Design a protein around this ligand. Structure first.
Ligand SMILES: Nc1ncnc2c1ncn2[C@@H]1O[C@H](COP(=O)(O)OP(=O)(O)OP(=O)(O)O)[C@@H](O)[C@H]1O
Ligand SMILES: Nc1ncnc2c1ncn2[C@@H]1O[C@H](COP(=O)(O)OP(=O)(O)OP(=O)(O)O)[C@@H](O)[C@H]1O
Lengths: 565, 565
C-alpha cells in the first residue's frame, strides 16, 4: 500500500498545505529567506571560485601590498561564503523546527479533536502507533525534508542557468541527452524506491511497536517487577527488537540497490558528457581540425556539461532522503487521512439500546428504557464482564449503540455531568491540575483568588498528607502519578476531582480500594451533601443505601430494574 | 554535566567496548570489510579520475575502435566505482543495524537485570526516560556514528599519503601549517560543541518526555476520553511540545555557530594553502624566476595541499555529526553507568521492620515480627495509604527496609512463591503467554503436550468466553490487553495465572472488581483446593473466612495481629 504512487502526492501536498498554510506565513517567509540566501551564496561561491584563479597573477610577480588587498578581499569573501552557507544550514534547521511545530500542532488538533485519541488507540488496528506518527515521524519527515530543502530550492535556478550555458556549447543534441539521463535516472529510482517505502513503513511500525513495548515496561514497572519478570520481558522485548532488526537489515538489503542506482548515475554522469560528443568519432559533421577542433572544444564542453550534472546529480543524490520522506508521509498521511474523516434534570434517555462489544456481534445489554432524574443515583451492579461499563461508555460518547437511541439532557462540565473511569486518570501536572483536570485552568474560569475549596476537599477526601508530598501546588511535580500514587488514593484524588467539579449528575464508576463503610460511605456522604446524584457501578453490599435502582445485568442482555429501598 | 570532557571518552570507549566486543566479532569483521572496501575504492576513484584526462587523447584523433576499449574500460570502472561506493554505504548501514543490535541487547541485559526496569522508572529522577535511551538514542547514536564510520576509516590512510605528497612539495613549513590549521580548527569546535551537547541532551529529554506524554494518552485513552479531555490534553501535550520546540529552536541558535566554525574552516582552507606560500612574497628565499619559479610551483603546491585538506576538512565536516554522537553517548553512557552499579514452609521472616515511603522519612509500618507458614494465609487489611502493599514490596525485593531484616525461605517460581500486583500486568503475547507469564515458555518446562490444564483453569476462573475472543491460543493477538480486556477479567486472568503456577504461598493482592461472595469467594475456593496459602490484601467482609490473621495497620506504624476465627 505505501507504494510511491500518484496517491502519495496528495498525501504530500495536503501535508505541504499545512506546512506552508499561505503566503506571508512563518514558514514561507522563512522559505523566501532560504531562496534569497542560496541565490546569494551561488554568486559568492562562483566569486570565491575565481580567487585562486586570480591568485597566480599576484603571486607570479611578488608584490605584497598588491597582495594584501587580495587576501583581505578573499577573507572577507570567505566569511561571506561562510555566513551564507552557515545561514543556509541554519535556516533549514530553523525551517525543520518551524515545520514540525506547524505539522504536529496540526496533528494535535486532529488527534485530540473530539475523541480521536480514543478511537485510534482502542478501536482501530489500521493505524497502529499514532504516538509514533505524531512525535517521531513528524520529526523524522521534517528533518529529512529540511535536509533536501536547501537543494530543492536552488535547483529550479542552477539547472536553468547551466542548461543555457550548455545550449550555447552543444545545442539541440546537448542537454536533452542529459535530460534523457534524468528520465532514465529517475525511472530507475521510482521503480527502486518502491520496496524501500514498503520496507520502511514496516520498519517504522516495528520501531514504534518496540518503543511502545518499552513504555509497557516504563508505565508498568511496578506490576512487572512483582513477577520478577526480568528474564521474561527480556525475551519479550528482544522478540520485539529482533523483528525490528530483521526489517532494518531488510531495508539495507533493499537500499543497497538504491545506493547503486544513485552512484551509477553520479559516476557514469562524469563520463556521459563525453559520449554526447561521440558525434565527431561516429559522424564528424563538423570535422575541421585534429588538434584544435577536437581538443579544447570538448574540454570546453565537458567543462560546462559536467558543470550541469554537478547541479543535476543533486536531485538524485537525495533519492535516499526522498525515499525516507516518502516513507514518512505514508505514515503521517496515513494518519491525518484517518483523522480527517474521524472528525465527521433528567440526566440521560435510553430508548431500546443494544450495546455490544465492538469485535463480537452479541449484545452485552439488549434493551434499555432508561431515564435518570435528580436525586435518583442508580446503581449498575452486575456480573464481571456483562457490560456494566459499556452502558457508561455510550453515555460519554465513547461507543455508539448498534441499535438504539441514546442522548443526554445535560451538558458535560463542572456543574453538568462528570464521569469517573474504572481505572482512573492522572495527567502530568501539579496537584492543582490533577483535581480540576477536565477544566485545565480555574482562575479565568472562577475569578476568585483563594482556592481554599480544594484544600478543603482534599482533607475532606482524606488525602491532605499528599499535599506535603507534592510540596504545595507548585509546577512540575516530576512524578508519574501512577506508580508514586496509590490505587487507594487514586480513587480519593479522583473523588476530590469530582468534589471540586460537583455536577448535577456524577457517572461515578468503581470506587473500590477504599473501606466499604469507613471511607467509601464517607466519600458518598459528600455526594448527598453536595447534591451530586451519582449513577455508580459497584457490586458491594454498602452502596444500596445511597442508590435507588439496582439494574442487574446477569446474562447476555438483561434488564432487571429493581428500585431497592 | 554533558560537556564533552575527558569523561566522555570513557563513556564512548565503554560503549565501543561492547559495539566491538573483541576481534573476529560480527562487527569487527564487518569493519575490516569496511576498511578494505574504502581502500579499494580510493584506488578506483583515482583510477577513474584519470579516465577524463586520457579521454582527450583518443577523442583528439577520432579512432572509434580504439575508443570503444576506453568506454568499456570506463563503464567497467564506473560499475566498479559504484559497487565499491554503494557497498561502502551499505556496509555502514549494515554496521548501523549490527551496532544497535549489539548495543540495545547489551542495554537490555542491563535494563532487565534484576529489577533495574523498576528502580529506574519509579525510584530514580536522574535518569528520566530510559525507554528513549534504549530505543531511540541507541538508534540515533548508531546512525550518526555509522554515517561518520566511512570517513573515520579512510582518514587514517588518506591523511598519511597526502602528507607524504605534501612533504615532498613544500617541506618542514608545509603540512604543519595545515596540522596547525587542524589544531586551531578543532579547538574552535571543542569549545563550540560544548553548548550543543548541553542543549542536545536537554533536547533529548524533552523529545523523550513528549513521546512518553503521547503514551500516557495511548495507554490511557479509555480513562481520558471519559473526561472528554481532548481540549485539556491538547494544552497539556502542546505544553510538552512547545518545551521541546523551544529547545530544538535553541539548538539551532547554538548549532549556527558550529556551522560557522566548519564552513569557515572549509572555505578558508581553500585559500590557506596559498598563504603557506607567502614565503616568496614575504621572504623569497628561493627566488629564481618570476614566471616559472612562481607559477606552476604554487600551482603544483595548491594541487597537492588543497588535495590534502580535501581529506582533512572531512574530519571537521562531521563535527556536527560528532556533536550529535557526543550528545547521545552522554545519554547512553548516562544510562549504562547507572545500570552497571545497579547490578551490584515458612514463607517469609520479618525481624523489626520499619518500611517507609522512599521520598519521606516517617515509616509506614514500624516493627514487624512476622512469620508465614503453610496453611496460614494471613490478611493484610487496613487503611487506604497506610502501606498495606509496602509490606509486600520488600517481600518481592522491590524495596528495602530502612531498619530491619527481611528474608524469604522459599524461592520464587511456579510452586514456590508468586506475587500478584495491585494493578495487574499483561504483556504483549498470546493467551497462552498471558497465563504462564513469569515462566515465558512451558513446553521445555513441562514436556507434556496437552495443555488442558489452562483450558480447565480459564473456565474454572470463568473467562473461557475470552478464548473465542482471542481465537484460540495463537500468536500475535494484536491487542493492548488493557483497554480490550476488563478489570473484572484482568483479575480473573491474573487468577488463572496464579492457578496455573500454583505456589506453596501466593502473595495475592486486591482481588477486587469481582463479586464478593459469588466469584471472589469462588476464586479463593480454588486456593484451598490447590493448597495455595494466599497471603492477601483486602478490606472486604468476606475474606476473613479464608484467612487466619488480620494484621491491621491503622496509623503511622501499627502492628495488631489478631488471628480472627
Ligand atoms: N475497547 C474495547 N475494545 C474491544 N473489546 C472491548 C473493549 N472494551 C471491552 N471490550 C470487550 O467487551 C467486554 C465489555 O466489558 P465491560 O467494559 O462491560 O467491563 P466490565 O468488567 O463489565 O466492567 P467493570 O470492570 O467496570 O466492572 C470486555 O470484557 C471485552 O471482552
Ligand atoms: N514507588 C513509589 N515511589 C514513591 N512514593 C511511593 C511509591 N509507592 C508508594 N509511595 C508513597 O507511599 C505510599 C504507600 O502506599 P502503598 O503502596 O502502601 O498503597 P496502599 O494504598 O496502602 O495499598 P493498596 O492500594 O494496595 O491497598 C503511597 O501512598 C505514596 O504516598
Amino acid at each position: 500500500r505505501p507504494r510511491l504512487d500518484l496517491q502519495f502526492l496528495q498525501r504530500f501536498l495536503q501535508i505541504l498545505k499545512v506546512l506552508f498554510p499561505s503566503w506571508s506565513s512563518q514558514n514561507a517567509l522563512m522559505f523566501l529567506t532560504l531562496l534569497c540566501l542560496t541565490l546569494l551564496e551561488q554568486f559568492v561561491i562562483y566569486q570565491v571560485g575565481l580567487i585562486p584563479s586570480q591568485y597566480y597573477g599576484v603571486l607570479g610577480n611578488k608584490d605584497l601590498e598588491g597582495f594584501k588587498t587580495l587576501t583581505f578581499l578573499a577573507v572577507m569573501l570567505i566569511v561571506l561564503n561562510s555566513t551564507l552557507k552557515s545561514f543556509d544550514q541554519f535556516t533549514c534547521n530553523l525551517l525543520y523546527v518551524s515545520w514540525r511545530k506547524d505539522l504536529t500542532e496540526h496533528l494535535h488538533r486532529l488527534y485530540f479533536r473530539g475523541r480521536a485519541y480514543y478511537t485510534l488507540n482502542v478501536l482501530r488496528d489500521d493505524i497502529d502507533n499514532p504516538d509514533q506518527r505524531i512525535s517521531q515521524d513528524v520529526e523524522r519527515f521534517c528533518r529529512q525534508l529540511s535536509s533536501m530543502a536547501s537543494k530543492l530550492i536552488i535547483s529550479p535556478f542552477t539547472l536553468v542557468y547551466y542548461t543555457y550555458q550548455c545550449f550555447q556549447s552543444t545545442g539541440w543534441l546537448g542537454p536533452v541527452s542529459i535530460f534523457g539521463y534524468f528520465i532514465l535516472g529517475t525511472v530507475v529510482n521510482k521503480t527502486l524506491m518502491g520496496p524501500i517505502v514498503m520496507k520502511l513503513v514496516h520498519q517504522e511500525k516495528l520501531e514504534g511497536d518496540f518503543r511502545f513495548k518499552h513504555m509497557q515496561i516504563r508505565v508498568n514497572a511496578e506490576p512487572a517487577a512483582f513477577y520478577r519478570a526480568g528474564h521474561v520481558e527480556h525475551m519479550r522485548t528482544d522478540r520485539r527488537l529482533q523483528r525490528l532488526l530483521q526489517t532494518q537489515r531488510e531495508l539495507m538489503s533493499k537500499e543497497l540497490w538504491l545506493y547503486i542506482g544513485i552512484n551509477t548515475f553520479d559516476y557514469l554522469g562524469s563520463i556521459l558528457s563525453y559520449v554526447v560528443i561521440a558525434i565527431p568519432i561516429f559522424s564528424g559533421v563538423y570535422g575541421d581540425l585534429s588538434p584544435a577542433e577536437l581538443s579544447t572544444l570538448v574540454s570546453k564542453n565537458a567543462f560546462v556539461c559536467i558543470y550541469l550534472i554537478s547541479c543535476f546529480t543533486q536531485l538524485i543524490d537525495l533519492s535516499t532522503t526522498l525515499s525516507d520522506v516518502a516513507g514518512y508521509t505514508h505514515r503521517i498521511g496515513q494518519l491525518r487521512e484517518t483523522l480527517l474523516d474521524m472528525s465527521l434534570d433528567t440526566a440521560f434517555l435510553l430508548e431500546r439500546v443494544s450495546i455490544s462489544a465492538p469485535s463480537s456481534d452479541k449484545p452485552l445489554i439488549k434493551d434499555l428504557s432508561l431515564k435518570i432524574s435528580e436525586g435518583q443515583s442508580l446503581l449498575i451492579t452486575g456480573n464481571t464482564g456483562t457490560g456494566k461499563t459499556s452502558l457508561l461508555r455510550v453515555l460519554g460518547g465513547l461507543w455508539t449503540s448498534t441499535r438504539g437511541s441514546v442522548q443526554m439532557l445535560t451538558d458535560f462540565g463542572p456543574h453538568g455531568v462528570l464521569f469517573l473511569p474504572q481505572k482512573p486518570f492522572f495527567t502530568d501536572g501539579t496537584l492543582r491540575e490533577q483535581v480540576i483536570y477536565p477544566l485545565k485552568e480555574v482562575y479565568p474560569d472562577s475569578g476568585s483568588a483563594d482556592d481554599e475549596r480544594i484544600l478543603r476537599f482534599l482533607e475532606l477526601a482524606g488525602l491532605s498528607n499528599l499535599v506535603a508530598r507534592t510540596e504545595g501546588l507548585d509546577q512540575q511535580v516530576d512524578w508519574n502519578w501512577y506508580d508514586v500514587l496509590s490505587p487507594g488514593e487514586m480513587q480519593r484524588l479522583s473523588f476530590a476531582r469530582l468534589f471540586y467539579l460537583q455536577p448535577k449528575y456524577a457517572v461515578l464508576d468503581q470506587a473500590t480500594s477504599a473501606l466499604t463503610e469507613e471511607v467509601e460511605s464517607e466519600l458518598y456522604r459528600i455526594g448527598q451533601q453536595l447534591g451530586m446524584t451519582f449513577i455508580s457501578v459497584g457490586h458491594r453490599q454498602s452502596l444500596e443505601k445511597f442508590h435507588s435502582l439496582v439494574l442487574k445485568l446477569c446474562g447476555g442482555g438483561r434488564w432487571e430494574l429493581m428500585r431497592i429501598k
